[PDB]
Design an enzyme around this catalytic site. Sequence first.
Site, short mmCIF file in Angstrom:
data_model
loop_
_atom_site.label_atom_id
_atom_site.label_comp_id
_atom_site.label_asym_id
_atom_site.label_seq_id
_atom_site.Cartn_x
_atom_site.Cartn_y
_atom_site.Cartn_z
CE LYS E 165 -4.06 1.91 2.71
NZ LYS E 165 -4.85 1.68 3.65
CE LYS E 190 3.05 -8.16 -7.18
NZ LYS E 190 3.25 -6.75 -7.52
CG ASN E 191 10.23 -4.76 -5.83
OD1 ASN E 191 11.56 -5.28 -5.74
ND2 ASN E 191 10.13 -3.63 -5.03
CG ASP E 192 3.12 -2.66 -7.33
OD1 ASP E 192 3.04 -3.72 -6.42
OD2 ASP E 192 2.68 -1.71 -7.25
CD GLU E 193 1.71 -5.44 -13.19
OE1 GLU E 193 2.07 -6.28 -13.97
OE2 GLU E 193 0.61 -5.10 -12.69
CG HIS E 286 3.29 -9.88 -11.35
ND1 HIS E 286 2.15 -10.18 -10.74
CD2 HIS E 286 3.29 -8.49 -11.30
CE1 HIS E 286 1.35 -9.06 -10.56
NE2 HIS E 286 2.22 -8.03 -11.06
CG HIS E 320 0.68 -12.42 -9.16
ND1 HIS E 320 -0.36 -11.76 -8.30
CD2 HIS E 320 1.95 -12.14 -8.41
CE1 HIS E 320 0.23 -11.00 -7.54
NE2 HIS E 320 1.66 -11.16 -7.59
CE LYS E 328 -16.97 -19.74 -16.37
NZ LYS E 328 -16.78 -19.15 -17.82
#
EC number: 4.1.1.39
Lengths: 137, 97, 97, 97, 459
Positions: E165, E190-193, E286, E320, E328
Amino acid sequence: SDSKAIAQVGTISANSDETVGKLIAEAMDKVGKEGVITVEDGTGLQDELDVVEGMQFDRGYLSPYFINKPETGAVELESPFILLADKKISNIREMLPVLEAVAKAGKPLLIIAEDVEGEALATLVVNTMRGIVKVAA
Amino acid sequence: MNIRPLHDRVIVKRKEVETKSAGGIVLTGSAAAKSTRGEVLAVGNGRILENGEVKPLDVKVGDIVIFNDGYGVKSEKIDNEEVLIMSESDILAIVEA
Amino acid sequence: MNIRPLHDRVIVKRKEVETKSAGGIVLTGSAAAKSTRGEVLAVGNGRILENGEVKPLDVKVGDIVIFNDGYGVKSEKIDNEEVLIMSESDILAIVEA
Amino acid sequence: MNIRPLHDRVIVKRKEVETKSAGGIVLTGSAAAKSTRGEVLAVGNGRILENGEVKPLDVKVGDIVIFNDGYGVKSEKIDNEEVLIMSESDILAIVEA
Amino acid sequence: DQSSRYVNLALKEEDLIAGGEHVLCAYIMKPKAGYGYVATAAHFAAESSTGTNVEVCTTDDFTRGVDALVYEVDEARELTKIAYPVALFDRNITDGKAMIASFLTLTMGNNQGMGDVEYAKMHDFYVPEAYRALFDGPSVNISALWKVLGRPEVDGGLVVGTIIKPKLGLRPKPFAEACHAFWLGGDFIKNDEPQGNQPFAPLRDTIALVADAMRRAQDETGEAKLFSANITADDPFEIIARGEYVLETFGENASHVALLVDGYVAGAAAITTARRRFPDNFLHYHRAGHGAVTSPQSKRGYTAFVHCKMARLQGASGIHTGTMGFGKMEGESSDRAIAYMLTQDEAQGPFYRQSWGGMKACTPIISGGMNALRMPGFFENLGNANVILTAGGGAFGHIDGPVAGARSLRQAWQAWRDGVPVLDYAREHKELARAFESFPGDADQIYPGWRKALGVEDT
């Protein structure tokens, strides 16, 4: 040891340029025997000598709002207290009694710290902008 | 509009939030702090429990009190003001003097 | 400010923390230890349950007590001091002398 | 210090831990065992529930008891000795005679 | 290209599967209109192996050993099942295990550059019973993370993690501080992409600062924790540099390191590279850009089933997977069914029944996130928890945000594993008491009456 003799050995090692001889003889004098000299690429056609006095290090203001001399684009504080925190500052909880005591003294304060996070930085920005305490971090 | 809390409910409004004078000096920034203090606006008829007569609640309108501001405390919009609804038990203490 | 707890509530202030004399000798650093002991500042009028009369609480002002410092105990700011508020059931024992 | 547990509370100290005589002979190493047996140091005034009179607790000082050394017991430091505090309902039996 | 020889429906699925003669991939494949389906499926098999484009020669024409073959095809059910020669997946020199760069190259990558395949979603595959142990294979995975965390190597359950965050723009040391705060909470990040070497928060300072934050958080919690560095780069040697740097940066905790690869934008070359020098470390797949393939906005590339089942093949220690509670349908690409497929070494997929001896487990990595209380429900449906969380406010709308809630939802499993579910460990662990208190959106109905037994006044 004399300035003249050093200027010659400078000139000779430079391949017979008196300019560097004078320049290095000047630098060696102004920085003192314990001083340090370095060389780097300039921009103009002339050689130039910059001398720095006292202590200097490559860290700036953490926010532009600390700029109290916007004509210069710089921060200056006179008779400041200096707080040396070997840590993050994360919460004003940490600062409150210090800022009050500095606020009690009325002198400006410089903060040198591992980091000053947004909450503390924002609070300092408000209090410095609104003139309650002069502070730089 | 006046409102009648239907027994054990109490209606209050909170005091000022994030008082801008921390230690009386430093204009604190926001810290997501919320005051536990409020003014009693309305008090229910009493306590219905034990098949006894409905004994009154000990607080009265215009009391200033310390309350537990927990998730059980609800809040409502009336006359465009914010107000808070709670049991007597959610009030911790009365601000005297 | 004086405070009156609104029955069954009790208010205390904590004793000193991390007493620097482990074995009476070595100056302890922080170990995140917290004292379970405090002094009774105010006591509620009594216990309201079971339709019986509001019998008094057994502690009195100026008592020093051992209490369960569990999640039921809340904490509050008064006179810029910290204070603690609890049920009688959170007080474990009374410390004499 | 003396301490009075404040109704339903009882104070005990555990008996010896990890008796070094398995089968009376083999010296057990540390095997995470803790004695369910302790000696009652102080006993509260009684039980206040149900609006009856405060009948006393059934244990008395100097009783040796088997107790549930489980999540209910709590513990405190006094006279630098450790002691344990529990409900009577933590105590499973008196080993008499 | 070509369909001749590439149609080989005479191949028995029994010798292909149980005989292990081929890697067997089931595609829901639809051609573009007017193309012959079996030709497209067979032509898609050629792209899924030798290529064989316009012409093939070896100084004297022909090439016929490398071909992956269609072995069941059925136009009206959109089914394309392709059997791949084990020679397609050349063995990595580090371990003798096949380079997964080939597999993706031959399933959901260069082979998908075929245009008359409108889509070829692989719903399942099989890998030969023996040679499976010599698929790239996750030499580190949830089971080794358990080991470095000090958990038992069987059902060490949920390695809790977060998406920091407030996601992007958080500078390295605020990001590291958000990691520290989270690691005053749970276990993994994780780091973000975009948070590679991009200038808003490059890898080196962030990973240096984040590594310090991990040690600080460990020292302040008494339990091990993990970070997944975004090694994803356009240069595989810069990927190696990021991978080596993070290992060297965590040093005494180098085994704690995870290697975030945005494998879809990184490609399986990056995945294969991040598996190569780093077998003792957690390759974190990821899913950047995955809307082009796995999401319902597309029918191309992987299903989430094979996406993560291939993460097993990748030696992606985790991946991920989507979101842990999948809607469904199940078996067909449910994250819950995937969590079986990845964490239990004996499972049924929607076209193949497979064991996973010798090659080891894979870890589902969860985005979005259940609260700490719903997850023991997923665990009860999964019969284990052997996954990683990597989610935001859905799991970390806790009263302590990413912090205590992230301890809480680890212990929520531990109670489930004790057969008590989370109620007991919320009596034991304060973070779970605060978690029942934070997540009444499920807490008061997924695991009954906590409010009286758990906590005190207002919980």
